[PDB]
Design a protein around this ligand. Structure first.
Ligand SMILES: Cc1cc2nc3c(=O)[nH]c(=O)nc-3n(C[C@H](O)[C@H](O)[C@H](O)COP(=O)(O)OP(=O)(O)OC[C@H]3O[C@@H](n4cnc5c(N)ncnc54)[C@H](O)[C@@H]3O)c2cc1C
Ligand SMILES: CCCCCCCCCCCCO[C@@H]1O[C@H](CO)[C@@H](O[C@H]2O[C@H](CO)[C@@H](O)[C@H](O)[C@H]2O)[C@H](O)[C@H]1O
Ligand SMILES: [S]
Length: 407
């Protein structure tokens, strides 16, 4: 008999647990450990961040749902991982042994990369978590009562650009739907992208033209090839570069309300394991989702490392999105079950791809790109009411599955 532990109940983690339990059966122990006691649908966070959805709409208590499925659940953060002894030290000092480990910890939001940028230290906020986006909203209403400049975008080293655009548009939108838009001194978009709608994938479809035009229609000035050196005194210090990295200018932007997509790092407990991860803190796995340094550690999701295909003037990364994360999960599950049965698992993540959906209210934007390098086999960007319909349906679907189980 084996004890399988899945760390982190997020987009890859909640499913991995349901699946793992399915694949193994009453024969083995499955344990899901996560920092928070509830699950959250991430894609819905920008909407919380502007106040279109409540927390209670996009999150729920994990415990009951997984335990009714034979899965043990610990609402506790992993502080330490000993890959040698194969023990996990919890927040509360308790420890947990495993036979096989599956890491699904998602990202560390590397605020520290830009001093002052932490949502608790200043006006630059975050919509990556429900707590943070609830925070953003608060500050947004502070802006409402007392209008000042707005800065939205993505930090240097970011890899998740879509939600920035989405957030900019929906904020723009929401102001008008309050008429308060013309009360705004300036509305600025700042991004590490070498051009608008690069999205960390060298553009998909006509993302350059459509996003460029959108920001213009909304009276949002856009700068590219930017990094924020520091936030300070409610001011955003910004350096802009050329294709070689030399400086073409430096800005000081007053911020009254802002949101910048931070760079993702591996979380501490995972990055801390010696030999496990790259300098970013991302787990170095093989095509079977198995660590190259520990045979009984697998990884899926944002937590895993993926080599860069392009090097941009200001550091940027490629996003790791839903569909590909599911492939990662299921492969790892199969390869682990195979490990408790003699075989080596042959299953893989599949072809690299990115799929993203943004809802602006009545209609939405979406893209599909695969594989990672152009020319691609699929390169599509779409806008339309039907995208909105799909996001709503997919959110409803995914949340139900996370209560009923998967297989
Ligand atoms: C705002 C935004 C919008 C996005 N929208 C889309 C989109 O539209 N479509 C799509 O395909 N992708 C979307 N994504 C990208 C991606 O799919 C999500 O970020 C997704 O949640 C990634 O899943 P994950 O399992 O890898 O990480 P997460 O969902 O964040 O899960 C990681 C889990 O591990 C936990 N954890 C971390 N450290 C510890 C620890 N020490 N101990 C215990 N638990 C720990 C966390 O609490 C969390 O529960 C979006 C990303 C962002 C942030
Ligand atoms: C998914 C993540 C990446 C992006 C996140 C957020 C993106 C921001 C949204 C920008 C869209 C704004 O601009 C909008 O785009 C499309 C351009 O094709 C226009 O729409 C145009 O093409 C569509 C079909 O695709 C037609 O239905 C429409 O009749 C036509 O006018 C809209 O008239 C314009 O209002
Ligand atoms: S993303």
């Amino acid at each position: 008999m084996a004890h399988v532990v899945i760390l982190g109940a997020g987009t890859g983690g909640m499913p991995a647990a349901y699946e793992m339990k399915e694949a193994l059966g009453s024969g083995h122990e499955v344990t899901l450990i996560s920092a928070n006691d509830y699950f959250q649908f991430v894609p819905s966070n920008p909407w919380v961040g502007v106040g279109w959805k409540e927390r209670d709409d996009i999150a729920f208590p994990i415990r009951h749902y997984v335990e009714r499925k034979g899965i043990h659940f610990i609402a506790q953060s992993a502080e330490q991982i000993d890959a040698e002894a194969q023990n996990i030290t919890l927040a509360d000092g308790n420890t947990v042994h495993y036979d096989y480990l599956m890491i699904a910890t998602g990202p560390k939001l590397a605020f520290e990369n830009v001093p002052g940028s932490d949502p608790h230290e200043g006006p630059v906020q975050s919509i990556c978590t429900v707590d943070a986006a609830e925070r953003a909203f608060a500050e947004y209403q502070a802006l409402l009562r007392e209008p000042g400049p707005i800065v939205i975008g993505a930090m240097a080293g970011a890899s998740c650009f879509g939600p920035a655009y989405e957030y900019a548009m929906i904020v723009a939108s929401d102001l008008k739907k309050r008429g308060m838009r013309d009360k705004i001194p300036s509305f600025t978009f700042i991004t590490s992208e070498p051009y608008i709608g690069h999205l960390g994938i060298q553009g998909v479809g006509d993302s350059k033209g459509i996003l460029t035009k959108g920001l213009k229609e909304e009276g949002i000035e856009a700068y590219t090839n930017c990094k924020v050196t520091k936030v300070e005194d409610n001011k955003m210090y910004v350096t802009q570069v050329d294709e070689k990295g030399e400086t073409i200018k430096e800005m000081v932007l007053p911020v009254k309300f802002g949101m910048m997509i931070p760079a993702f790092k591996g979380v501490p407990a995972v990055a801390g394991v010696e030999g496990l991860c790259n300098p970013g803190g991302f787990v170095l796995v093989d095509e079977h989702q198995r660590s190259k340094k520990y045979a009984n550690i697998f990884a899926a999701g944002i937590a895993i490392a993926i080599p860069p295909v392009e090097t941009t003037p200001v550091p940027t990364g490629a996003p790791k999105t839903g569909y590909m994360i599911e492939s990662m999960v299921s492969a790892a599950v199969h390869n682990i079950k195979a490990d408790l049965e003699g075989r080596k698992g042959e299953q893989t993540m599949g072809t690299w791809n990115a799929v993203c959906f943004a809802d602006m209210g009545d209609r939405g934007a979406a893209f599909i790109a695969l594989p990672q390098l152009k020319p691609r086999k699929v390169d599509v960007f779409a806008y339309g009411r039907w995208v909105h319909l799909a996001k709503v349906a997919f959110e409803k679907y995914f949340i139900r599955k996370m209560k009923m189980g998967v297989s």
